[PDB]
Amino acid sequence: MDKNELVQKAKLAEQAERYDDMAACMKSVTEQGAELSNEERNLLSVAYKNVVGARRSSWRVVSSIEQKTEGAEKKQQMAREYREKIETELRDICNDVLSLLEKFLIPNASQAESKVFYLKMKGDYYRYLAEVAAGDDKKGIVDQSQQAYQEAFEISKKEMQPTHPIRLGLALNFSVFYYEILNSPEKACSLAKTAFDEAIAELDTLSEESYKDSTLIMQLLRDNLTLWTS
């Protein structure tokens, strides 16, 4: 259909909380090949955050039940088979996002802000794959997440001020990758602490359009820091 008609149905789907419809319309917008506006970019990220977020949330519940039913064969086996059903949905969702990122979003990103946004997004959805990966393929999935974050990180440090919300949000999620995926609390804390401290050393650089997002993300960075130090 028309791009603008796809976008307004995605906005309709969002307010109806029909995030499958929302992702379907933003996936169609992306496949038309043109660079997404900042508004279209946010709509695609919100839609898939919610479609994958439902599976991640259900995965953690079922995985925790699987962990707490050791000694109860029937219940553990049902939880394990259900977890595997949920894992397949989760993997299909992130392969869908990661193929949009590699075919359209990253190669057509003309600005540094957009490159950092999508490289972080690429780091995010490989991290979601790493959350549920096991065996041989986990090492490669973890490396793909780390290298996506690492490239976004280098671009962000060279092109963005420390108070930029996209740079801060990337530092937040990269910090989480180190803690939860790489099981490295020092590196996680040191990344979150440096991002917080570098932002607070140049609060003059805060825009009024961004200051509330930037100050919230700073608070979230220090929340993880204080929880990872306890």
């Binding site: 937040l172 997002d213 993300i217 979230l220």
Partner: peptide, 7 residues
């Protein structure tokens, strides 16, 4: 806590 939606 990873980045939440702020849109």
């Amino acid at each position: 806590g990873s980045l939440p939606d702020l849109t």
